[PDB]
Every structure is written in structure tokens, then in C-alpha cells.
Amino acid sequence: MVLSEFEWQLVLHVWAKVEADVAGHGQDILIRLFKSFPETLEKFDRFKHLKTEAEMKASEDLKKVGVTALTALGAILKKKGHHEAELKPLAQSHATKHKIPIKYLEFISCAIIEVLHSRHPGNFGACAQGAMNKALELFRKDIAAKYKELGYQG
Ligand code: HEM
Numbered sequence: 001m002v003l004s005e006f007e008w009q010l011v012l013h014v015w016a017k018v019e020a021d022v023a024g025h026g027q028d029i030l031i032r033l034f035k036s037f038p039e040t041l042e043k044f045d046r047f048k049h050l051k052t053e054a055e056m057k058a059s060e061d062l063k064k065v066g067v068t069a070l071t072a073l074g075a076i077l078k079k080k081g082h083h084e085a086e087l088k089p090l091a092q093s094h095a096t097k098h099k100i101p102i103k104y105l106e107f108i109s110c111a112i113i114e115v116l117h118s119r120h121p122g123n124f125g126a127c128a129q130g131a132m133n134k135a136l137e138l139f140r141k142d143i144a145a146k147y148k149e150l151g152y153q154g
Contacts, residue, residue, distance in 0.1 A: 001134065001141065002081065003080070003131070003134050003138065006131075007135070008080045008081075008135070010127060010128040010132070011077055011128075011132050011135045012077065013123075014116055014120065014123070014124050014128055014132065015074055015078075017116075017119075017120055017123070018070060018074070018116070022070055022071070023063050023066075025066070025070060025115060025116075025119065026063055026065070026066020026067040026070050027056070027057060027062065027063050027066055028115045028118070028119070029066055029069075029108065029112055030056070030062055030065060030066040030069075030111075031053050031056045031057070031062075032114060032115055033107060033111045034050075034056065035053065036107070036111065037107040037111075040104055040107060040108075043098065043099075043100065043104070044062075044065070046061070047059070047062060050062065069108075072086070072090060073112075073139070076139060077139075081138060083142065087139075087142055087143050088146065090143065091143050091146035091147055091149075092150065094143070094147075095147045095150050095152040096150060096152070101154055102140060102143070102147065102154035105139075105140050105143065106140060109133075109136035109137075109139070109140065112136065113129055113132050113133060116129075117129060
């Protein structure tokens with residue numbers, strides 16, 4: 001799959017809004033991940049006492065985890081698919097160390113799109129949601145290929 005320039009521009013336009021409050025987006029995305037797909041919380045044992053949205057919102061640690069992921073993803077999206085160098089260390093750590101299945105990357109991709117729609121409904125319409133869906137699908141396809149090159153199914 002290959003995105004058009006129009007699709008990349010829709011993705012990068014909404015990402016500038018993410019960056020304007022990266023902490024709030026990162027919190028909301030991880031909270032949605034943990035609440036809508038509760039199985040993912042097991043990958044973060046240190047968050048085991050955070051049982052509700054408001055408890056999660058108090059955690060600077062959880063916020064930092066979200067900002068770390070959004071920062072890496074933003075750098076990837078700005079490469080407009082020429083992101084092999086950025087995916088190398090991410091596949092290494094997520095396949096071999098954190099053991100994150102590709103399905104969980106699908107979940108967080110979905111959570112990203114839904115949080116962006118919740119926070120920016122007037123500027124993140126159906127076309128922009130579809131462009132972000134394509135960009136994140138490309139990310140997952142390419143990282144899954146790297147998982148397989150490390151010997152993991154994902
Ligand atoms: C857009 C998708 C994601 C991106 C860009 C991303 C990015 C990152 C980055 C940059 C780090 C720190 C460096 C590293 O260890 O490679 C990290 C750490 C980590 N990530 Fe991911 N991540 C993503 C999805 C996920 C998901 C879905 C999970 C679990 C359900 C996960 C679990 C972890 C864990 C356990 C760590 C170790 C650090 C910590 O415990 O806070 N990641 N991630």
C-alpha cells in the first residue's frame with residue numbers, strides 16, 4: 001500500500017493538533033487502550049492499581065508513556081512511509097523485549113483515531129480518519145514485516 005500526498009497531508013495536519021497538547025492526547029489514547037481493550041493493561045504491571053479513567057489521569061508515569069509513543073509515531077508519520085530506520089529499533093524492542101502482538105498495535109491505532117476524532121470532530125472528518133487509518137495500517141504492515149525478520153509472528 002502507498003498513501004497519496006493528499007493522504008499524508010491530512011495525517012500531518014491532524015498531527016500538528018496532537019502536538020499542541022501531546023500530554024492530553026497521550027493520556028487519552030492510553031486510557032482508551034486500557035479501558036476498551038483491558039487485556040493490554042497486563043503489559044504495564046506497574047499500572048495495576050489504576051482501575052478507572054480518573055485514576056489513570058493522575059499518573060504522570062502513564063502520561064509519559066503516552067508521550068513517548070506519540071513522539072516516536074509522529075517522527076514516523078513525518079517520513080511519509082520512508083520510515084525503515086525508525087521502525088528498526090521499535091520492532092526490536094516490541095517484538096523481543098516488550099512482546100507486543102501486532103493485534104495490540106491494531107488496538108492502539110484504533111484508539112489513536114478515535115481519540116483524535118473525540119478531541120477534533122470538526123477537523124477530523126471521514127476522509128482524514130481514512131487517511132490516518134491507511135497511515136497506521138502501513139506502519140503496522142511494515143513493523144509486522146520487521147517482526148518476521150526477527151523470527152516473530154507477532
Ligand atoms: C503506535 C504504537 C507504539 C509506539 C510508536 C510505541 C513506542 C514506544 C517507544 C518509543 C518506547 C520506548 C523505547 C522502546 O522501548 O522501544 C516504548 C516502550 C514500551 N512500549 Fe510501546 N509503542 C507503541 C505501542 C505499544 C503498545 C500497544 C504496547 C502495549 C499494549 C506497548 C508497550 C510498551 C512497553 C511495555 C514499553 C516499555 C516502557 C514502559 O514500560 O513504559 N507499546 N514504546
